[PDB]
Structures are given as C-alpha cells and as structure tokens.
Amino acid sequence: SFVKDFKPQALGDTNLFKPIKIGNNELLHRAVIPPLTRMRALHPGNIPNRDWAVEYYTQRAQRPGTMIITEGAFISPQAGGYDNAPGVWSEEQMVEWTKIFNAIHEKKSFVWVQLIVLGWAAFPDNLARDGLRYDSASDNVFMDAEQEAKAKKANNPQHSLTKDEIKQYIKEYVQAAKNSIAAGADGVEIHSANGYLLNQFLDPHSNTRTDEYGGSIENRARFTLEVVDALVEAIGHEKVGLRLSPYGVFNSMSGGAETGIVAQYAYVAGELEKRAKAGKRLAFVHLVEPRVTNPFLTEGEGEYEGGSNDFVYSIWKGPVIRAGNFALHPEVVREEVKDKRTLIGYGRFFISNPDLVDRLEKGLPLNKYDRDTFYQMSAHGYIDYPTYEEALKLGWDKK
Amino acid sequence: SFVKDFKPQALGDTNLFKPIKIGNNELLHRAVIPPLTRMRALHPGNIPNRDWAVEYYTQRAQRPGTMIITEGAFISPQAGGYDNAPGVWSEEQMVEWTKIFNAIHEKKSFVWVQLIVLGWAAFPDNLARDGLRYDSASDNVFMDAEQEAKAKKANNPQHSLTKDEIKQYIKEYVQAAKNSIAAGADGVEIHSANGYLLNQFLDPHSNTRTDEYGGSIENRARFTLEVVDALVEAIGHEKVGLRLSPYGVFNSMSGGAETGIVAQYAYVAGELEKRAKAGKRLAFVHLVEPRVTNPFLTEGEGEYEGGSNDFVYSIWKGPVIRAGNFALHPEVVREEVKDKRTLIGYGRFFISNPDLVDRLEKGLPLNKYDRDTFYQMSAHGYIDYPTYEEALKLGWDKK
Ligand SMILES: Cc1cc2nc3c(=O)[nH]c(=O)nc-3n(C[C@H](O)[C@H](O)[C@H](O)COP(=O)(O)O)c2cc1C
Ligand SMILES: Cc1cc2nc3c(=O)[nH]c(=O)nc-3n(C[C@H](O)[C@H](O)[C@H](O)COP(=O)(O)O)c2cc1C
Ligand SMILES: C=C(C)[C@H]1CC=C(C)C(=O)C1
Ligand SMILES: C=C(C)[C@H]1CC=C(C)C(=O)C1
Ligand SMILES: [Cl-]
Ligand SMILES: [Cl-]
Ligand SMILES: [Cl-]
Ligand SMILES: [Cl-]
Ligand SMILES: [Cl-]
Ligand SMILES: [Cl-]
Ligand SMILES: [Mg+2]
Ligand SMILES: [Mg+2]
Ligand code: NA
Ligand code: NA
Ligand code: NA
Ligand code: NA
Ligand code: NA
Ligand code: NA
Ligand code: NA
Ligand code: NA
C-alpha cells in the first residue's frame, strides 16, 4: 500500500533535479541511494546474492544518472561477522559485484561501494566459529547486554586492536578499494559512521585508548584519516567519499550527549578541507542527519533537536550528501537543496520504491516499506516492490 | 548628523525587548554594550579618566536594565602596553572604577569588566620603557611590519612565554577579577578574542609551541580554559563570561582560512558546556560575528561569508551574546533574537548613541559615529554625542 498520511509534493522545480558532478560521475539529479544493508548475501563466503542482487540494483538504477551507494561490504573476513552481508575481498564475491556494477551502468547510473569494518557490532559467536577476533578500539567498554551475552557464550572477548592490527585493516581497506574499482565501481565510500569500527575510534565513549589512536580529538580521528589517505593514494581522491554521523547513537555511540562531539567531527571535516586545498578533495562527505539518530526507529523517532550538521558547511567546501527522514518531508528537502552543493540520500523509501526518483519529481504517493523484510533472506520485500505504474495496476490507490 | 542611508525599524515587538537573566543580573532588554576601548585613561598609571569616564558610562547606562561590558582593562602592567587604556590592578585605578560602577548602578543597569592581556598587540617601545617584556605564545611569528619595526627600534624582542610566566598571568587574572568584583562590578568577561594574548594561544598561526600549551586543539585551548577555571573558582561561574571571535582576522589571527578553526572553537564551547553540566555554567559566551572580522573596517567590509557561528549553539546551551554590524541591520536582528537565549551587542553605534536602546525600540534614526574620536584624548566624540531629543533640538533631522 501507499503511505496513508502523506501529502506528496513535486520536487522537479528544485535543485534536487539539477545535474551535479560527483567524482567522475555526472549525476542527473541529486536523489542518492545511501548504503542499505539487506542481508541477502549467501553463506559461506559472504557472496552477493546470485539470484536477486542484480535485479534489486537494476530496479533502483532505473532513473538515468542516479548515484547508488551499495550496501556495506566487508573488506575482509576479520572485518565481518554477519553471515549474510557481502564482502569485497574474494574472486567469487567480485564476480557477482561485477554483474551488479555492469547492470547499474547499463541503466546509465553510478555505483559507489561502501567499505565496512564492524568492530564491536559484529557477532562474537560467528567470529569465534571462524577463528576470528572480536575487535574494537578498546576493551573496557562494551556495546550492549546482548553483545556481552553473545561474547561470554562464544568465549570470544572484546579485543583492543594493536597498532599492527590497525595497519592490517588499512591494508585490507586498500585492497578492497582496488578490488571494487577493478571490478567496475565508480568509487568507494569509507564508512566512518553508525557506530562501526572507525566510529568506535572517533567516539570517546568507545575509545579509551592512551596510545596515538586515542585520548584526544586528533588521535581519535587518526584511523579514519589514515584510511582516507591510504585510499586517496590507492585509487584517487575523486573515487573516495567519507560517511559520518556526528549525532548518531546507534551501536552505542555518544551523539549530542558528548559535549565534544561537534569538535571531533569539525576536526575531521577540517582535515578533509586541508587535503582539498592541497589538491586532493574527496568526491563527497556523506552525513547522517540528527533527524535520524538510529535508523531502526520509525521516522520521527530518535530525532535530536539539540544539534545541527550545518557546521560542516562552514568547514568542508565540497559536495555534501545528507540522509535521514527526507522522503516524508519534501518541505524540508525543498529548503535544504537551495544550497547548490547539497544532495539528499533516501534510504528506507528507496527500499520500497524502485522508481522513487520519478515519484519525487512528480509528487506521487510513496509505497510503504516493510521493515520485516529489510533483513530477510527473500525476494519478497527486496525485488517485488512495485513501481507507481505497477502499484496502480495492483489497485494500491484504493487500499 | 544621522546616518543617511538607513531605514530604521522598531524592534520593540521582538525578543530584543524581553527581559533575561545573565548571571546575577535581570536585564530588561537584550541590547548589550560590548567592550569598547576608548583610550581616555590617563598616564601614568593607566587610570580611568577622572574627568569624563563616569559621565560616558552614565550616559550609556541610561536605559534601565542595560548590560554594559567595559572597555578592556589590563590585569597588570606586563599585560598592558597602551598608555591610555585602563587597568584594574591598582588602588588608584579601582577608586575610579568604583565611581563608574556606582553610576551605572544608580541608573539601574549592570557592568561587567572585560579583562585583557595584549600579547603581541602591545607596543614594544612602551613596554621597553617600563622595563617590561613583549610577550606572545611564540617567538617565530610576528604580528605585522609596524610591530616588527617598533620592536627592532625598542630593542625589545617578541618573547615566547614560559610556563611560569603563563602561571603569573593567571594569578593576575584572578586578582584583577577579585578587584573588579570587590569594587562593585557585577561580573567579568575574559577576553579570548580579537587577536590578544589568549587568542594568540588559541590560533595555530600565532601558536607554534611544542609544549602542553600548543601543537593540538586541546593544548592551544589550555591557557584560555585555565583562566576560565581560575576565575570560576575565585568569584563564581555566575560572575564570569568568555569572549571569542572564531572568524576574526584582526591582529593577525587566522579566521576561516584555517580549516581547523571551527574545531578549535567548538572544542572550547564543548569544554564550557561540560563545566555547565558539572554545575559551573558561565554567565554567557560572547561571540564576534563573521559579519565583522576586523572592527576598524567600515560596516559591510571584512565580512566573511564562508562561515557561521551557529555551530556554537549546537554545543553551548547557555546565553549567547552576538556582536558585529547589527545596528544597521534590524532585519537580521529580528531573525536572530527569535532564538530565546540570544542577545545582541552593539558597539560602534553605542559609541555614538547614548540612548541607542530607545532608538532600537522605537525605530529612530541613528547618530553617525566619528571614527576619528574613537581613540582620541577628548570629551569630544566621547560624551557629547546627543540623545535623540538633543539631536532634534540641534536640528540634526535637517542635516
Ligand atoms: C535496513 C537498513 C540498512 C542500512 N544499511 C546501512 C549500511 O549498510 N551502511 C550505512 O552507512 N547505513 C546504513 N543504513 C542507514 C541508511 O543509509 C540511512 O542513513 C538511514 O536509513 C536514514 O535515512 P532514511 O530516513 O532515508 O531511511 C541502513 C538503514 C536501514 C534502514
Ligand atoms: C573603537 C572600538 C573599540 C573596541 N574595543 C574593544 C575591546 O576593548 N574589547 C573587545 O573585545 N572588543 C572591542 N571592540 C570590538 C567591539 O566590541 C565589537 O565587537 C565590534 O566593534 C563589532 O561590533 P559593531 O559592528 O556593533 O561595532 C572595539 C571596537 C571598536 C570599534
Ligand atoms: C551491516 C551493515 C553493513 C549495516 C547495518 C546497518 C547500518 C545502519 C549500517 O550502517 C551498516
Ligand atoms: C585595547 C583593547 C582593550 C581593545 C582594542 C580593540 C579591540 C578590537 C579589542 O578587542 C581590545
Ligand atoms: Cl501508512
Ligand atoms: Cl549472522
Ligand atoms: Cl584506480
Ligand atoms: Cl551617513
Ligand atoms: Cl600608547
Ligand atoms: Cl566574589
Ligand atoms: Mg509480512
Ligand atoms: Mg573631526
Ligand atoms: Na505486499
Ligand atoms: Na506538488
Ligand atoms: Na528466484
Ligand atoms: Na538484526
Ligand atoms: Na559634531
Ligand atoms: Na518600524
Ligand atoms: Na572637563
Ligand atoms: Na590606534
């Protein structure tokens, strides 16, 4: 069915429908697909779904000139810990990714691989089974009671990374980025948001290290910026973006309750702008909005009103993608896109609307999403959401 | 004469005319007099002007419930270097300050002493004459060619403060604050703006130290926060405010050209909010706006459009005073005061309009200021600017 209490607005008369260049890609509009984990990858081997993933991405690439950021992809086995999320370290994985990239490109759209390392969000019991560590910045604070329980049962203790192990992850980021580009991707996004490993280093709650990787703003940002620099050198600044969620609390990050949080993220933004003036400007910075501090709460919940991401614009002078509860708020998007370097990521409603871009342009009703199939091993709630045409044929306008 | 090309607007229907409590003071409106050096203090001894200073402040206290921040006052001889700016270290000084405070209080207004230390802005030749050092954070970067010339001639080299000398300044801040309160002031403002000594420590251009007072965000902020803590302990958090100018370039500060500048100031704001949650909230943070990056450029010049101070509001949750080109822009003030913890500092137009508050309320013409008498040793351009009533009697409406 369509979302019941929603008054659509056509956005075709706004900058959302003005072309913009991001890295090497000439986007034809500024509605971006942000990274969305769907858990259809197959075990063993963290292989992109051989039955459905091409179709899923093809559907969502249908509007020409759309920028798609993939679901997060593990850079290595040690970086993972969910059996049904994909990786980008193996030949068998890359064979499937290449088909996905080719399909997106045939629709004249673009694809950026999000590179992920889980840290304390990983399942310690899956990792123990595979003879892998359970990693984080520190070993004296733990994500939550369920993770604690899983770790006790699996007898797999949270492990504070050594400097050598940080370097090994950096090597893996580099190879994963190279694999992605060689397989046909337009670029990569470094995930430093949502409470995964890089965020665990940025955040003073999860990072209580006393070496050069913790204990100050500069030190907490070190790992993230090392990955940035390593990938810029490996594949080019124009093929690299960075994702941040300054106000996020998902996976036990501090958000606005930490009074130093703006400073921490302002520092990162400043260091990116320094590199940009020095000839190496990232393709984009991607921000999760305080509109959504936890993406598994229904739209309107988990809003933080005590802070804004606008500070980033005073510092970083490149493109900015913003995501978080924008689909149901065209009135907000209309204002935000007046800034000529702002793009809008639409997550949950791109799950449920393969033709979302057409619907945004024309002010059409939106398909409701089905949270029960966000992570299911099924084609249902993955590739069977209808376009607007299909929805009308199905009688959804009278449901 | 009145300002010729200005269309006044009455602001009496806005929050500018709603009462607010700042520290111990019940302000009746939110038009604040920011600190304005006038150079009428007498030499020797840096004594507030015995002929005119009481009258000057009395005039500008005339609207009941006005918050007045004094001209900057030196905490010690070593902190000074201008012969005609006042100090707050001596009995002879405090005798005059007490008369000033009493006069302001008789008008049912309030007075906060701004405490200053010049650093590299001081005149090296005056200091040499008095057997004093020429101080800054570092000794390998210098303010400008004129200061260099003065230092060479006076044979008084720029000196990088030792840690012991920083401690001595802190002792002096404490005694100056105590002197101010004991003499009758309602509070003090710590000047950490406009390129004076504390700002010279905050800014990475002027601070190239490799000890604990430089080389990182936390270290560059150390001196400012030490002064904050020392004064909070000495006279109470409710009697202390802090002034900052993140985007200022006056006295050779970096402003927005430094990509780390927002992070630096965001850190300070965060550390103030941390103290506030821990039971010691400063009375206010006072910000100079990027509207005015150098206060000796005519309104509209030296505007920096690449940055906003709005970031401070995401971090610091107390009152914020904002200053910079607001007198000629009532349309901007009308929007800014919709925020219920925002006050507006009016500098140059309070120099020229002793009854500025009445004029803001009622939308009256403003007296032009005379920059030639900003720093003159004269009553002219100090205590002879007319109220609106006096200006009409003088025929200014037909000039
Ligand atoms: C099912 C689901 C999966 C997600 N997967 C990822 C991910 O792999 N990487 C990431 O950075 N964010 C991920 N997110 C967060 C989204 O990219 C996005 O920021 C968030 O959903 C808010 O935007 P929205 O309100 O438009 O849905 C996910 C969100 C959802 C709901
Ligand atoms: C003549 C003059 C003297 C000033 N003296 C001081 C001072 O002692 N301390 C300070 O922090 N700022 C000082 N300032 C800066 C002002 O407080 C204020 O921030 C600035 O003039 C911008 O506001 P305006 O546009 O309303 O004049 C001075 C400015 C002027 C023009
Ligand atoms: C497993 C992952 C790759 C994603 C899970 C959900 C969110 C919000 C992420 O950021 C990462
Ligand atoms: C001599 C001083 C006390 C003031 C001089 C001018 C400005 C803008 C200040 O901030 C300080
Ligand atoms: Cl609904
Ligand atoms: Cl799993
Ligand atoms: Cl490449
Ligand atoms: Cl004029
Ligand atoms: Cl002088
Ligand atoms: Cl006291
Ligand atoms: Mg169902
Ligand atoms: Mg004259
Ligand atoms: Na259905
Ligand atoms: Na419409
Ligand atoms: Na099938
Ligand atoms: Na789950
Ligand atoms: Na005159
Ligand atoms: Na009016
Ligand atoms: Na006289
Ligand atoms: Na002068």
Cis omega (within 30 of 0) for bond into B290? no
Atom of ligand 4 nearest to the CA of B295: 8
Distance (Å) of CA B173 to CA A389, B45, B156, B206: 73, 18, 24, 21
Using only C-alpha atoms, what is the Rg of chain B? 20
DSSP run (H or E) holding B113: strand B110-116
Angle between helices A217-235 and A261-277 (to 10 degrees): 30
* Other residues' Cβ atoms within 10 Å of the Cβ of residue B65: 19
CA distance A311 to A269: 9
Residues comprising chain B, all counted: 399
Three-state SS for A218? helix
Residue B212 in contact with partner chain A when CB distance is under 8 A: no
Distance (Å) of CA A162 to CA A166, A206, A209, A213, A299: 6, 15, 10, 10, 39
- Whether the Cβ atoms of residue A307 and residue A262 lie closer than 8 Å to each other: yes
Three-state SS for A206? coil
CA A131 to chain centre: 27
Residue B249 sits in a domain of what CATH number?
3.20.20.70
Contact residues for A273 (Cβ-Cβ < 8 A; gap 6+): A315, A316, A317, A318, B259
Contact residues for B28 (Cβ-Cβ < 8 A; gap 6+): B19, B63, B64, B65, B66
CA distance B63 to B108: 8
* Direct distance between the N- and C-terminal alpha carbons of chain A, in angstroms, rounded to an integer: 6
Instruction: State the residue range of the domain holding A57.
Output: 1-399
Please give the sequence-ordered ranges of beta strands (E in DSSP) within chain A, or none if there are none. 20-22, 25-27, 31-32, 67-69, 73-74, 110-116, 134-136, 158-160, 187-191, 240-244, 284-288, 320-323, 342-345
Strands A25-27 and A20-22: antiparallel
CA distance A99 to A47: 12
Contact residues for B135 (Cβ-Cβ < 8 A; gap 6+): B78, B118, B119, B120, B122, B158, B159, B161, B165, B197
Q: Which amino acid, residue A346?
A: Y
Contact residues for A95 (Cβ-Cβ < 8 A; gap 6+): none
Burial A292-318, CB ≥16 within 10 A → b, else e = bbbbeeebeebbbeebbbebbbbbbbb
Nearest Cβ partner for A274 among B259, B267, B317: B259
Per DSSP, the residues of A316-356 read --S-EEEESS-TT-HHHHHHHTTSTTEEEE--HHHHH-TTH
Q: Which residues of A are annotated as a binding site for substrate?
A: 191, 194, 375
Three-state SS for B165? helix
- Whether the Cβ atoms of residue A25 and residue A186 lie closer than 8 Å to each other: yes
Residues comprising chain A, all counted: 399
Q: Is B331 exposed, middle or buried (0-12, 13-18, 19+ CB in 10 A)?
A: exposed
CA distance B397 to B390: 11
Contact residues for A244 (Cβ-Cβ < 8 A; gap 6+): A192, A193, A265, A268, A285, A286, A287, A288
Three-state SS for A27? strand
- Whether the Cβ atoms of residue A60 and residue A321 lie closer than 8 Å to each other: no
Please, what is the Cα angle at B367 between B364 and B371, to 5 degrees?
150
Contact between A262 and B315 using a beta-carbon 8 Å cutoff: yes
Contact residues for B168 (Cβ-Cβ < 8 A; gap 6+): B78
Angle between helices A217-235 and A163-182 (to 10 degrees): 30
Closest CA to A70 of A79, A59, A57, A81: A57
CA distance A387 to A396: 11
List, as ranges, residues with CB under 5 A of the ion ligand 14.
A 9-10, 363
* Other residues' Cβ atoms within 10 Å of the Cβ of residue B18: 12
Angle between helices B163-182 and B217-235 (to 10 degrees): 30
Three-state SS for B70? coil
CA distance B361 to A75: 63
Strands A320-323 and A25-27: unpaired
- Which residues are B114's β-sheet partners? B189
The two tokens of residue A237 are 């600044």
Three-state SS for B195? coil
CA distance B40 to B85: 7
B36, B37, B114, B288: residue to mutate for ligand 4 pocket, most atoms within 8 A of CB: B37
- Whether the Cβ atoms of residue B70 and residue B94 lie closer than 8 Å to each other: no
- Whether the Cβ atoms of residue A181 and residue A188 lie closer than 8 Å to each other: yes
CA distance B93 to B98: 9
CA distance B185 to B106: 13
Residue holding tokens 């003005």? A18
Nearest Cβ partner for A217 among B217, B277, B317: B217
Q: Which amino acid, residue B104?
A: I
Read off the DSSP letter of residue B367: B
CA A227 to chain centre: 16
* Other residues' Cβ atoms within 10 Å of the Cβ of residue B72: 25
Atom of ligand 1 nearest to the CA of A34: 17
Tally of domains within chain A:
1
Residue B204 in contact with partner chain A when CB distance is under 8 A: no
Burial A243-255, CB ≥16 within 10 A → b, else e = bbbbbbbbbbbbb
Specify whether the backbone of B325 is left (phi greater than 0), alpha (psi in -120 to 50) or beta: left
Residue holding tokens 């950096």? A170
* Other residues' Cβ atoms within 10 Å of the Cβ of residue A380: 12
Q: Is B82 one of the annotated active-site residues of the chain?
A: no
Sign of the alpha-carbon dihedral angle for B116, B120, B123, B125: positive
CA distance B101 to B111: 7
Read off the DSSP letter of residue A266: H
Phi and psi at residue B78, in whole multiples of 5°? -60, -30
CB under 8 Å, gap of 24 or more: what pairs does A207-214 form?
A: A207/A137, A207/A138, A208/A137, A208/A138, A208/A140, A208/A141, A209/A137, A209/A138, A209/A160, A211/A163, A212/A163, A213/A137, A213/A163, A213/A166, A214/A137, A214/A138
Q: Is B62 exposed, middle or buried (0-12, 13-18, 19+ CB in 10 A)?
A: middle
- Whether the Cβ atoms of residue B219 and residue B262 lie closer than 8 Å to each other: no
Nearest Cβ partner for A311 among B271, B273, B311: B311
Angle between helices B163-182 and B91-106 (to 10 degrees): 50
Beta-carbon contacts below 8 Å between A and B: 82
- Whether the Cβ atoms of residue A322 and residue A316 lie closer than 8 Å to each other: no
Residue A274 in contact with partner chain B when CB distance is under 8 A: yes
CA A119 to chain centre: 15
